[PDB]
Amino acid sequence: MKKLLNTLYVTQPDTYLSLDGDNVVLLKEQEKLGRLPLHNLEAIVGFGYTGASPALMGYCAERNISITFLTKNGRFLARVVGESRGNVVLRKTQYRISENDQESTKIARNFITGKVYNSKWMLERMTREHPLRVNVEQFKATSQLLSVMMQEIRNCDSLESLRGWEGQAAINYNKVFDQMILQQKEEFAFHGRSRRPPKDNVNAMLSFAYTLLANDVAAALETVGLDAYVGFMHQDRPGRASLALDLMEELRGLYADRFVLSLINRKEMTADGFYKKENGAVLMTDEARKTFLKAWQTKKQEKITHPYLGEKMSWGLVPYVQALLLARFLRGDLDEYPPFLW
């Protein structure tokens, strides 16, 4: 139950952020650009070389206002993490459960079940209303295979078997995801994955969407009181946001890729926005970035109803409430963590 406060994205290079009372002020070589109240903001995303005084960071990290820095293309350069709080019971329980394999499997089962259920529901939804333009029978067969392997996932008992089933589901879903070029020309054809260099179209949008999802999931996990660097799943590499990835593994199926696919089908953006350097992979322009962020922010305000809670709330509150629904489970208020099954 919140208001889904707004978000500030600064794009001009060589800006500067300062604090005046409860206001944030944008300065540039002693020339002011604007000021905004800090009681109507949740995240501050800086692009390029943007500086902030220590007072602003100290005031923001204490009141659960996230600050994120991106170089030009949604990189994970640097965030701002503040002090801890006096809720050591929750962290103690989380670490105790993380040290146990059985409970980690109990959470990973719910994570994967929610992810694959969301994928199957999305595939069936797309198969339903579309004409012969798409291959309905192959999609139905893939959905049936996913629904069959659903029950096998539901009764897993180890991390390695669950990881293998997750990989199989990913391959099976990508096999049919390679199809969506419906209302766009051949320049937007999916041709696999490229992690660090966005060398083709679509991928340069998917990476940015994934970064924007991670910067929100991590902020929500920090706000709710949990620690966003120890996870119930994934190979526990030190120094990564494992819990954030675990929590967004189920929301990536409807919050990032669906946005890109719907933007492509609606033809909101066209291939002329993207360009290429000598190699340069594929990079966006200022207008492309502005349109992407405008569409993203406009979409984040649509109102839905939560399945488990049965209450009406904005779209953008989905990444937060889920994390809250985890914390209550860690206090024994539920039987198992209820995932997102939209």
Binding site: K3, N6, T7, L8, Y9, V10, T11, Q12, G21, D22, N23, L26, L33, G34, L36, P37, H39, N40, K290, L293, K294, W296, Q297, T298
Partner: protein
């Protein structure tokens, strides 16, 4: 929640501490909302922030000499505000890309 509130003040600077009262009122009103015209502020606040601001302004100003008016336009403030002149005000609900 998140309703539009408009605050208008009018302090007396011919008294003993008029300048100090004006400065403190301006500082306490700029912390929550924007300025559209001299001696008028507009903000998008919830009920708790409105109560806190009202209490602070009441405790800060002095009676029998100053004036303060507070209006609330509700949740439908988009269709009630009309602007004709040339002093634009930044909206706090659009994507707000700077």
């Amino acid at each position: 929640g998140s309703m539009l509130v408009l605050i208008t003040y009018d302090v007396q600077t011919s008294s003993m501490g008029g300048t100090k009262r004006l400065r403190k009122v301006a500082k306490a009103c700029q912390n929550y909302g924007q300025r559209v015209q001299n001696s008028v502020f507009e903000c998008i606040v919830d009920s708790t922030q409105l109560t806190s601001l009202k209490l602070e302004l009441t405790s800060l100003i002095d009676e029998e000499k100053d004036s303060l008016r507070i209006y609330r336009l509700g949740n439908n403030y988009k269709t009630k505000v009309e602007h004709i002149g040339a002093k634009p005000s930044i909206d706090l609900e659009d994507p707000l890309i700077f």
